[PDB]
From Swiss-Prot:
Site (Important for C5-methylcytosine-recognition): W14
Modified-residue entries (Phosphoserine), positions: S49
Domain CSD positions: 10-72
Homology family: Belongs to the YBX1 family.
Phylogenetic classification of the source organism: Eukaryota, Metazoa, Chordata, Craniata, Vertebrata
Parts of the chain that traverse the membrane: none
Region (C5-methylcytosine binding): 14-19
Compartments, as annotated in UniProt: Cytoplasm; Nucleus; Cytoplasmic granule; Secreted
Domain characteristics, as noted in the entry: In the CSD domain, Trp-14 specifically recognizes C5-methylcytosine (m5C) modification through its indole ring.
Function noted in UniProt: DNA- and RNA-binding protein involved in various processes, such as translational repression, RNA stabilization, mRNA splicing, DNA repair and transcription regulation. Predominantly acts as a RNA-binding protein: binds preferentially to the 5'-[CU]CUGCG-3' RNA motif and specifically recognizes mRNA transcripts modified by C5-methylcytosine (m5C). Promotes mRNA stabilization: acts by binding to m5C-containing mRNAs and recruiting the mRNA stability maintainer ELAVL1, thereby preventing mRNA decay. Component of the CRD-mediated complex that promotes MYC mRNA stability.
Effect listed in the UniProt record for changing W14F: Decreased binding to C5-methylcytosine (m5C)-containing mRNAs. Decreased ability to discriminate between m5C-containing and unmethylated mRNAs
Subunit and interaction comment: Homodimer in the presence of ATP. Component of the coding region determinant (CRD)-mediated complex, composed of DHX9, HNRNPU, IGF2BP1, SYNCRIP and YBX1. Identified in a IGF2BP1-dependent mRNP granule complex containing untranslated mRNAs. Component of the U11/U12 snRNPs that are part of the U12-type spliceosome. Identified in a histone pre-mRNA complex, at least composed of ERI1, LSM11, SLBP, SNRPB, SYNCRIP and YBX1. Interacts with IGF2BP1 and RBBP6. Component of cytoplasmic messenger ribonucleoprotein particles (mRNPs).
Protein name: Y-box-binding protein 1
Post-translational modification: Ubiquitinated by RBBP6; leading to a decrease of YBX1 transactivational ability. Phosphorylated; increased by TGFB1 treatment. Phosphorylation by PKB/AKT1 reduces interaction with cytoplasmic mRNA. In the absence of phosphorylation the protein is retained in the cytoplasm.
RNA sequence: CAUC
């Protein structure tokens, strides 16, 4: 719920569609942030997914277990 | 739903 950072750019380390989660490495701090599939904004063209090695833009928010990505989109 |  609580927003820590906005408009953060990062690269997807991995995302596993079976388990429905992954990690994004923040460009700004170089730390991994957890991303759940629900946190990813709906695709134009696995409606909620990101691809390994892709650059994405997201908010960082406070989850139960730590920092997690929110509102994950393409850059811009 | 936390290193698959």
């Amino acid at each position: 719920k609580k927003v820590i950072a906005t408009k953060v750019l990062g690269t997807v380390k991995w995302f596993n569609v079976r388990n429905g989660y992954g990690f994004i490495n923040r460009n700004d701090t170089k730390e991994d942030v957890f991303v759940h599939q629900t946190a990813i904004k709906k695709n134009n063209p696995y409606l909620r997914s990101v691809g390994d090695g892709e650059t994405v833009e997201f908010d960082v928010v406070e989850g139960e277990k730590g920092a997690e990505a929110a509102n994950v989109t393409g850059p811009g």
